[PDB]
PDB file of C-alpha atoms and ligand atoms in Angstrom:
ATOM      1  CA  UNK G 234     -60.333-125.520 129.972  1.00 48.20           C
ATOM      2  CA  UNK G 235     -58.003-123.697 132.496  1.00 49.18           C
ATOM      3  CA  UNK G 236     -56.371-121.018 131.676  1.00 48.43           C
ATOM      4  CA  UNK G 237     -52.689-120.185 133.433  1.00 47.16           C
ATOM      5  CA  UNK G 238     -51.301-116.432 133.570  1.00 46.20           C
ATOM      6  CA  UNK G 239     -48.136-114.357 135.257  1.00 44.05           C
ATOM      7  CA  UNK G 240     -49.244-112.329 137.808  1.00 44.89           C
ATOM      8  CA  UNK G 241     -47.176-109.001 137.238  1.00 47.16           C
ATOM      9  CA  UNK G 242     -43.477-108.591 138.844  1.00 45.32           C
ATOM     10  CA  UNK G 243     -44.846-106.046 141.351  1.00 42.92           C
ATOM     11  CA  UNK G 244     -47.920-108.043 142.740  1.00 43.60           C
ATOM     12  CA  UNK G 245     -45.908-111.095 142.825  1.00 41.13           C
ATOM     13  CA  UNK G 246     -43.040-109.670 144.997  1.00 39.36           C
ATOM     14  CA  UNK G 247     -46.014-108.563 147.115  1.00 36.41           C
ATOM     15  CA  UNK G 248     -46.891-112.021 147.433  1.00 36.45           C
ATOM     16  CA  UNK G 249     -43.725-112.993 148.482  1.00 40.08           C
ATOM     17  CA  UNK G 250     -43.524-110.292 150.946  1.00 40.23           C
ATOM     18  CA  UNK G 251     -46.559-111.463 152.625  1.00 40.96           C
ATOM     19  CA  UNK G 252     -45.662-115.005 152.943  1.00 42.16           C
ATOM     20  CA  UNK G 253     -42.004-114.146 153.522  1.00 44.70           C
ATOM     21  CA  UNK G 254     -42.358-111.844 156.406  1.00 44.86           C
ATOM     22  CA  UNK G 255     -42.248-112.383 159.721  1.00 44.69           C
ATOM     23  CA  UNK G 256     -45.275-110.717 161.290  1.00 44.67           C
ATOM     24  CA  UNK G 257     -47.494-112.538 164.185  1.00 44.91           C
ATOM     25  CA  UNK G 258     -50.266-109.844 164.089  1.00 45.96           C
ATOM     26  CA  UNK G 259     -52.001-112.588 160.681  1.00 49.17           C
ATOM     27  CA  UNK G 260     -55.536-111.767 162.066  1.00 52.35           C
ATOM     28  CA  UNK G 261     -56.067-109.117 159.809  1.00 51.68           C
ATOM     29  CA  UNK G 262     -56.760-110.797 156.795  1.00 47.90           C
ATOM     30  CA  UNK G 263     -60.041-111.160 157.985  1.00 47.95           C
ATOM     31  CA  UNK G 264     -60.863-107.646 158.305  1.00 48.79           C
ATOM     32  CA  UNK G 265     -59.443-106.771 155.009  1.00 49.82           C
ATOM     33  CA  UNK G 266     -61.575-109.630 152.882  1.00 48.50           C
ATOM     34  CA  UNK G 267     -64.827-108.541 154.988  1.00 48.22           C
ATOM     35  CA  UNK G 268     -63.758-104.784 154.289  1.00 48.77           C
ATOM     36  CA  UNK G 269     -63.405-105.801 150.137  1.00 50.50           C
ATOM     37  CA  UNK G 270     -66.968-107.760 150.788  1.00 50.04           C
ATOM     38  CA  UNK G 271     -68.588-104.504 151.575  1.00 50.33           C
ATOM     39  CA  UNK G 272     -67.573-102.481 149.037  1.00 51.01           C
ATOM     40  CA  UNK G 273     -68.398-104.817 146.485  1.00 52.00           C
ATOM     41  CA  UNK G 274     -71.463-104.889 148.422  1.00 48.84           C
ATOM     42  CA  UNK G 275     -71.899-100.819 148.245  1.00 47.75           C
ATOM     43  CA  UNK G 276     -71.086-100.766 144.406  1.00 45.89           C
ATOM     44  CA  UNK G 277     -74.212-103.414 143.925  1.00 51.87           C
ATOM     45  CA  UNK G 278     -76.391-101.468 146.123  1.00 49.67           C
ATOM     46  CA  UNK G 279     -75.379 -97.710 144.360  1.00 47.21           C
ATOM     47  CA  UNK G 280     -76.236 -99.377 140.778  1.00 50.63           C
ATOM     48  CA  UNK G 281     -79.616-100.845 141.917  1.00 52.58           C
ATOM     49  CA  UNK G 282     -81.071 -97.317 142.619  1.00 51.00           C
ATOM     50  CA  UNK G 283     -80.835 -96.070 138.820  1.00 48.87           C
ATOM     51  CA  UNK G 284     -81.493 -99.873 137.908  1.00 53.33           C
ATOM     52  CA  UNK G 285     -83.446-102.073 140.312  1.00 55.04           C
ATOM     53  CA  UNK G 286     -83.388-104.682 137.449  1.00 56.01           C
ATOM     54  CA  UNK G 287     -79.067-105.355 138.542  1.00 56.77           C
ATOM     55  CA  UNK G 288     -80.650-107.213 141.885  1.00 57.88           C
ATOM     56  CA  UNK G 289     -82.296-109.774 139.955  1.00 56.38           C
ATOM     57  CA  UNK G 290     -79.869-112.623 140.336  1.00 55.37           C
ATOM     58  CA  UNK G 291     -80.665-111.906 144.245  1.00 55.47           C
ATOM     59  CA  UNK G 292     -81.985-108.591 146.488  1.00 52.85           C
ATOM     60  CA  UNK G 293     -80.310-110.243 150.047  1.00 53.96           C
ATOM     61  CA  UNK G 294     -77.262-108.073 150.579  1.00 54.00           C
ATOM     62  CA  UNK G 295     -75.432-110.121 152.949  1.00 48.80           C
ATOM     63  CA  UNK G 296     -71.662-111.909 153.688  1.00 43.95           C
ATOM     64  CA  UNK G 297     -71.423-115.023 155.275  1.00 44.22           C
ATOM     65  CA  UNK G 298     -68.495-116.672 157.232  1.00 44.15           C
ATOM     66  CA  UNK G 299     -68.019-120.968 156.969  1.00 42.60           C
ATOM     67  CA  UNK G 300     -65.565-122.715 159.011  1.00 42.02           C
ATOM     68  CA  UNK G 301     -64.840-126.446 157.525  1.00 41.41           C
ATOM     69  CA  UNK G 302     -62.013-128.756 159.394  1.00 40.34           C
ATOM     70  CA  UNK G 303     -62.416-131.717 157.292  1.00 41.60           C
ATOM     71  CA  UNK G 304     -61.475-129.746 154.206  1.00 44.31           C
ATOM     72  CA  UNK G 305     -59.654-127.169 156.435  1.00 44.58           C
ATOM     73  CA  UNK G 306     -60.868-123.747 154.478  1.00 42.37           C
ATOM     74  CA  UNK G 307     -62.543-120.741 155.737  1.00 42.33           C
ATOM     75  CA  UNK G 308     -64.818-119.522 153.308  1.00 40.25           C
ATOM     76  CA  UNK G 309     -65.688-115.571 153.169  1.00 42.13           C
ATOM     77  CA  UNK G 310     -68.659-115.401 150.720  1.00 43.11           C
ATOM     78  CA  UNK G 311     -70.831-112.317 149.698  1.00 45.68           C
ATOM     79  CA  UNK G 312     -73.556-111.185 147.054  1.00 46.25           C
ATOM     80  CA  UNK G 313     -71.649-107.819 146.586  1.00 48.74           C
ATOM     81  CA  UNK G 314     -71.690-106.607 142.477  1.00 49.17           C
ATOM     82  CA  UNK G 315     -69.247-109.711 142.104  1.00 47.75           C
ATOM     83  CA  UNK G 316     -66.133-109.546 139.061  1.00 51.49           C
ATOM     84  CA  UNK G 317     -65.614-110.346 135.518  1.00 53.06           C
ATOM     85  CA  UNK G 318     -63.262-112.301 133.400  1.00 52.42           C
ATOM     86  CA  UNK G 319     -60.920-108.753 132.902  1.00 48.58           C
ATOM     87  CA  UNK G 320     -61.553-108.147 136.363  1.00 48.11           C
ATOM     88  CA  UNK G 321     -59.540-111.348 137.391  1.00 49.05           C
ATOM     89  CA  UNK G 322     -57.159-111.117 134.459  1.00 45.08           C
ATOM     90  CA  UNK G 323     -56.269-107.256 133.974  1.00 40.82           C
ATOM     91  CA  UNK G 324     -58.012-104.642 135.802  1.00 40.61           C
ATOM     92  CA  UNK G 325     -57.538-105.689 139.733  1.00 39.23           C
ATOM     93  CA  UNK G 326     -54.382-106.237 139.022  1.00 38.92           C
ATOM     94  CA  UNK G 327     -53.357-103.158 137.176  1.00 36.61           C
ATOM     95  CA  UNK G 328     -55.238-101.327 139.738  1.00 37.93           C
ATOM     96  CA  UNK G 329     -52.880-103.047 142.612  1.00 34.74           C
ATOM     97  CA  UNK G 330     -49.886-101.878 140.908  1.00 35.91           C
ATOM     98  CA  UNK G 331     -49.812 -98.043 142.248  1.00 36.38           C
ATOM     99  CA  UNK G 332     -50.723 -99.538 145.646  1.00 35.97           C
ATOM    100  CA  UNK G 333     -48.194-102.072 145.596  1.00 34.21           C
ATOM    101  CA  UNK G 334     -45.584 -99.787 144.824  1.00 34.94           C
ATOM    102  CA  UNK G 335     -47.061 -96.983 148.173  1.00 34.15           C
ATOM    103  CA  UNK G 336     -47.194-100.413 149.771  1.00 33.21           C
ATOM    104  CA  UNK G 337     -43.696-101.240 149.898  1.00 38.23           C
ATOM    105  CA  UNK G 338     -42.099 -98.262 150.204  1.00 38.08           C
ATOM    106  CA  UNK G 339     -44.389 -97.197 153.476  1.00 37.08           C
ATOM    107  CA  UNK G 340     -42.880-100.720 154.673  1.00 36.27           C
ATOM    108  CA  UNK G 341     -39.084 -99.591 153.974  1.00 38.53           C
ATOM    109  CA  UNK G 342     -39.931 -95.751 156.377  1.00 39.67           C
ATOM    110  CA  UNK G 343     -41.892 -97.873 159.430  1.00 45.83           C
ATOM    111  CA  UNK G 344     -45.361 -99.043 158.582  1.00 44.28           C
ATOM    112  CA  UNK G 345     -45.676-102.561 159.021  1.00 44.07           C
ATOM    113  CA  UNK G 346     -48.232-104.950 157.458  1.00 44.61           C
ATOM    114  CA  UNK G 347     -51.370-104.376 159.099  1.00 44.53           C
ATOM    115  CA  UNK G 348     -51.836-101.000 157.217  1.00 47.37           C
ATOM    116  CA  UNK G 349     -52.182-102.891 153.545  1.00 51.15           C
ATOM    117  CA  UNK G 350     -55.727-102.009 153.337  1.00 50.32           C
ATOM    118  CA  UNK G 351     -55.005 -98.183 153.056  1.00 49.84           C
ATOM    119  CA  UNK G 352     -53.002 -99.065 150.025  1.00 46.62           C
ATOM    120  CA  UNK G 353     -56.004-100.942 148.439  1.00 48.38           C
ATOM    121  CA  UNK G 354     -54.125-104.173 148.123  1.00 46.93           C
ATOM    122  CA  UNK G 355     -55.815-106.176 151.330  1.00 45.48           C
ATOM    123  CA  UNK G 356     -57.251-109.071 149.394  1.00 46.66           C
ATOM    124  CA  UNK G 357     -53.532-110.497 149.033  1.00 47.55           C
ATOM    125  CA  UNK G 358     -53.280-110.658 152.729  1.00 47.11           C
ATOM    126  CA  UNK G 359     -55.274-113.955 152.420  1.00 48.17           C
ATOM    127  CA  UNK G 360     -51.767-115.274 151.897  1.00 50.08           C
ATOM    128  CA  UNK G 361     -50.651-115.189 155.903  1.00 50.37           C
ATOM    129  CA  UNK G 362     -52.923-117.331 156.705  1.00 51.41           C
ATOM    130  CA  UNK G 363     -53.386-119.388 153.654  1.00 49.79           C
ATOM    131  CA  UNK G 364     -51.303-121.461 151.545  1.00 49.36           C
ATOM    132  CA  UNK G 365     -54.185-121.623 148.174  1.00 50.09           C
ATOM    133  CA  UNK G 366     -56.920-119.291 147.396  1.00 48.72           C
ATOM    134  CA  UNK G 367     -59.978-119.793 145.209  1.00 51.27           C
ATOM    135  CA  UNK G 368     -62.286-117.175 144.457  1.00 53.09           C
ATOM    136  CA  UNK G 369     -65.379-118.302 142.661  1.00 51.73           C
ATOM    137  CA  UNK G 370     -67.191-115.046 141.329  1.00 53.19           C
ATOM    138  CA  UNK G 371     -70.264-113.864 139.318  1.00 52.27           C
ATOM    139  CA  UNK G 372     -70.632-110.622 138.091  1.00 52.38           C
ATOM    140  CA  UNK G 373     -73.918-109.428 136.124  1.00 56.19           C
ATOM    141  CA  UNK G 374     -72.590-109.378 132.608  1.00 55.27           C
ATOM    142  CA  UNK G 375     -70.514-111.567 132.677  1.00 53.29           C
ATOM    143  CA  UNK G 376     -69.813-115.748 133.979  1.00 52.91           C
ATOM    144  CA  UNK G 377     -69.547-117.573 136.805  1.00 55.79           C
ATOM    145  CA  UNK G 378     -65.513-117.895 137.337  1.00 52.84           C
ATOM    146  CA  UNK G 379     -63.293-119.600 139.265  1.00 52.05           C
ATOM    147  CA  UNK G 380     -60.117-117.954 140.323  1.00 49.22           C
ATOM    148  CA  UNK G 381     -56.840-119.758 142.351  1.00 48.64           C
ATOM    149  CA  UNK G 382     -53.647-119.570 142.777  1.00 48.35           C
ATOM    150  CA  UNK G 383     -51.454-120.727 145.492  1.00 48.18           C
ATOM    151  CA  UNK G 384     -48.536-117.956 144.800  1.00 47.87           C
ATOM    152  CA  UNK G 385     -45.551-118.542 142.824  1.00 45.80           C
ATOM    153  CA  UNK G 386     -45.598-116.430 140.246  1.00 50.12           C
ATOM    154  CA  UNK G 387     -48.845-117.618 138.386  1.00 46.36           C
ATOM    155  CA  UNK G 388     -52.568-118.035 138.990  1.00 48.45           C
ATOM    156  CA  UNK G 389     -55.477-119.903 137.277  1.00 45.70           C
ATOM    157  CA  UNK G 390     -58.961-118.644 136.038  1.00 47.62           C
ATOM    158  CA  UNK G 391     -61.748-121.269 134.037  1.00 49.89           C
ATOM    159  CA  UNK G 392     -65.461-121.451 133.738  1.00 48.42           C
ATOM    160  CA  UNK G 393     -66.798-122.442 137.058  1.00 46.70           C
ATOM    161  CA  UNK G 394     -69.008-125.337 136.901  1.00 43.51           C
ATOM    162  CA  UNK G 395     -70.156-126.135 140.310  1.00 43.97           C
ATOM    163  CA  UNK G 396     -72.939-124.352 142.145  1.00 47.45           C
ATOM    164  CA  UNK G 397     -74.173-121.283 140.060  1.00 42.72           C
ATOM    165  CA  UNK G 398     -74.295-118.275 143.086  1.00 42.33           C
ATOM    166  CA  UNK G 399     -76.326-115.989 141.240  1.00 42.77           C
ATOM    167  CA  UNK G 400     -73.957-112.664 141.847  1.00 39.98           C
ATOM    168  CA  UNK G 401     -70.897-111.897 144.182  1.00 43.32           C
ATOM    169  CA  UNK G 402     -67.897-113.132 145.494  1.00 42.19           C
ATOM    170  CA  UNK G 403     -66.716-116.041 147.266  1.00 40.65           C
ATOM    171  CA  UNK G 404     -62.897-116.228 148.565  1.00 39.60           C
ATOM    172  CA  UNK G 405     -62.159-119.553 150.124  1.00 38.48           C
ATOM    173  CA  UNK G 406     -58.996-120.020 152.003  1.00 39.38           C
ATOM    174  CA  UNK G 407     -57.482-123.144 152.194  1.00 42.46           C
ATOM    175  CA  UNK G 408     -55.286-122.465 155.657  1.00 42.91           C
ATOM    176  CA  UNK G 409     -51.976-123.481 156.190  1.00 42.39           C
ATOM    177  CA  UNK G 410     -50.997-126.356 158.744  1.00 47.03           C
ATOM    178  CA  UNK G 411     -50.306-124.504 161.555  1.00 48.08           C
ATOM    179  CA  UNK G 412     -53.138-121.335 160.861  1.00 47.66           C
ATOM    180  CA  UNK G 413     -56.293-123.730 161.895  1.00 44.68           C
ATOM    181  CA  UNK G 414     -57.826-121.250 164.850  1.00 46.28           C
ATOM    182  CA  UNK G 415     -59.629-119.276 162.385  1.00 47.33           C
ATOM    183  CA  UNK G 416     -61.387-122.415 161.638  1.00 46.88           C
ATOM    184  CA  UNK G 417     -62.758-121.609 165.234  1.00 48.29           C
ATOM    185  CA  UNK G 418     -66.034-120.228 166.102  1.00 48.21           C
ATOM    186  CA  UNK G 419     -64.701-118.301 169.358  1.00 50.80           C
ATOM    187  CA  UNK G 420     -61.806-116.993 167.805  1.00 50.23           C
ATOM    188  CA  UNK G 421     -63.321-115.480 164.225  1.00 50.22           C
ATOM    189  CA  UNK G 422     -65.996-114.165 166.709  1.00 50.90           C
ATOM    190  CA  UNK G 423     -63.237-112.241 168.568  1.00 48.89           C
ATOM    191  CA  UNK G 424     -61.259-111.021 165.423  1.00 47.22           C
ATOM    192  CA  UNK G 425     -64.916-110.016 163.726  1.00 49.69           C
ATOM    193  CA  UNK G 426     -65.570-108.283 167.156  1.00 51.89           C
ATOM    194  CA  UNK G 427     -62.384-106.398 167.282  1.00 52.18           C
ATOM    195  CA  UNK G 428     -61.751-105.285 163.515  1.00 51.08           C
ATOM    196  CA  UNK G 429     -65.377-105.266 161.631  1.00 52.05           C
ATOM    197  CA  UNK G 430     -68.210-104.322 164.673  1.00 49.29           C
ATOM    198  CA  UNK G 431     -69.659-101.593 162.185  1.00 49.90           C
ATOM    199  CA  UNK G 432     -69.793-103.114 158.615  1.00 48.86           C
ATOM    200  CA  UNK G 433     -72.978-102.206 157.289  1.00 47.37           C
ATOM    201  CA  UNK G 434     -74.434-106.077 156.243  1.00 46.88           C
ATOM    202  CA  UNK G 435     -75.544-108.839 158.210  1.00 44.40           C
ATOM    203  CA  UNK G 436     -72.367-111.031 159.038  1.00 42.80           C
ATOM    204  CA  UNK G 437     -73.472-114.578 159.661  1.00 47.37           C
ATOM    205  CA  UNK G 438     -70.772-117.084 161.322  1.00 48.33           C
ATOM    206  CA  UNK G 439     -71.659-120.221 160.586  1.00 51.32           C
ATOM    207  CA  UNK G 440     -70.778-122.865 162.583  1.00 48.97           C
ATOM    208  CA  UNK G 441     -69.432-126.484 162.344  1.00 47.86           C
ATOM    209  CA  UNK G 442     -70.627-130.079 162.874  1.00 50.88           C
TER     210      UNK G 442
HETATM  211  F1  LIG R 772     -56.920-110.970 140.666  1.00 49.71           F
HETATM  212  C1  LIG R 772     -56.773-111.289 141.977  1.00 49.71           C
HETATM  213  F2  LIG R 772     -55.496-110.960 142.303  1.00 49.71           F
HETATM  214  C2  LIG R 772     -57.769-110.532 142.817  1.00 49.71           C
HETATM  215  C3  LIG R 772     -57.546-109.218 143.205  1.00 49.71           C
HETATM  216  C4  LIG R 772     -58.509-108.556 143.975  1.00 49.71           C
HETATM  217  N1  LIG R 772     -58.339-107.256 144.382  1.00 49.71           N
HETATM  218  C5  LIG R 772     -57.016-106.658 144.545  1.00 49.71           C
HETATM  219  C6  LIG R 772     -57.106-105.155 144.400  1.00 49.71           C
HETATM  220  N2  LIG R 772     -57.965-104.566 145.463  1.00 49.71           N
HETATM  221  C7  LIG R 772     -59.121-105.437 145.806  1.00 49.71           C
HETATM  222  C8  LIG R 772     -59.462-106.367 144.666  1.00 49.71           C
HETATM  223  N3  LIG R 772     -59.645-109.160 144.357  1.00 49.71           N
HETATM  224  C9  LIG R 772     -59.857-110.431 143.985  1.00 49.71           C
HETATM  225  C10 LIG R 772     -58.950-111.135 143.220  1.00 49.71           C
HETATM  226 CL1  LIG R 772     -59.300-112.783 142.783  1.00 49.71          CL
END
């Protein structure tokens, strides 16, 4: 069963924006979906001290990085507090709105892309580099989902029934033709390196065949 919804007018035109735009300086969606994996990573680790029973679907507090060619995706995947079915529906995108709106009009007086994070809207910057997302998440109370949407206007959520994670958050990117160096071990070294040095968690970059 898949369910199809509108994302609102406002985060769609940010969509559009991103993929619309020309701006070379793409690298920064990386820092922006590890800077998201930490928080979520935070808010699990905050709840655990007045409840150490919220780590039981896994105590490793950790994000991992996988490169795949043959399926061209770059997979970001942490066990941060992970999201519900409102979550994906509703709240994050509610939430986006207000930043969205600061967003844009920052853009029209001289800020320029790389600054989305301070508007807490950096998760849509997956969209310079990638054509379809799919975010497969498990939050405590709630199910194992699978997100995706590959812009236009609309995005899908359903039951995931693949590989249960246990809890958190895992954003693949399926790149775009001509976006294949961050499938690259040297150059996701670099751009972790340069934009993410002092993230609190173990990052782990896997590497290929
Ligand atoms: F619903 C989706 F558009 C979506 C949004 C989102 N966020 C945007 C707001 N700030 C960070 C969290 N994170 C994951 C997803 Cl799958």
């Amino acid at each position: 069963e898949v369910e199809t919804f509108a994302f609102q007018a406002e985060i769609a035109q940010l969509m559009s924006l991103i993929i619309n735009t020309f701006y070379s300086n793409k690298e920064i969606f990386l820092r922006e979906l590890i800077s998201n994996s930490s928080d979520a990573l935070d808010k699990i680790r905050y709840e655990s001290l007045t409840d150490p029973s919220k780590l039981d679907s896994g105590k490793e507090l950790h994000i991992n990085l996988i490169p795949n060619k043959q399926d061209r995706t770059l997979t970001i995947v942490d066990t941060g507090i992970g999201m519900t079915k409102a979550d994906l529906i509703n709240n994050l995108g509610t939430i986006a709105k207000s930043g969205t709106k600061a967003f844009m009009e920052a853009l029209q007086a001289g800020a320029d892309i790389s600054m989305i994070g301070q508007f807490g809207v950096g998760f849509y910057s997956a969209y310079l580099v990638a054509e379809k997302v799919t975010v497969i998440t498990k939050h405590n109370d709630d199910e194992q989902y699978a997100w995706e949407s590959s812009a236009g206007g609309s995005f899908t959520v359903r039951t995931d029934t693949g590989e249960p994670m246990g809890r958190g958050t895992k954003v693949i990117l399926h790149l775009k033709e001509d976006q294949t160096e961050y499938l690259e071990e040297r150059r996701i070294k670099e751009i972790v390196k340069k934009h993410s040095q002092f993230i609190g968690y173990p990052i782990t970059l896997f590497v290929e065949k």
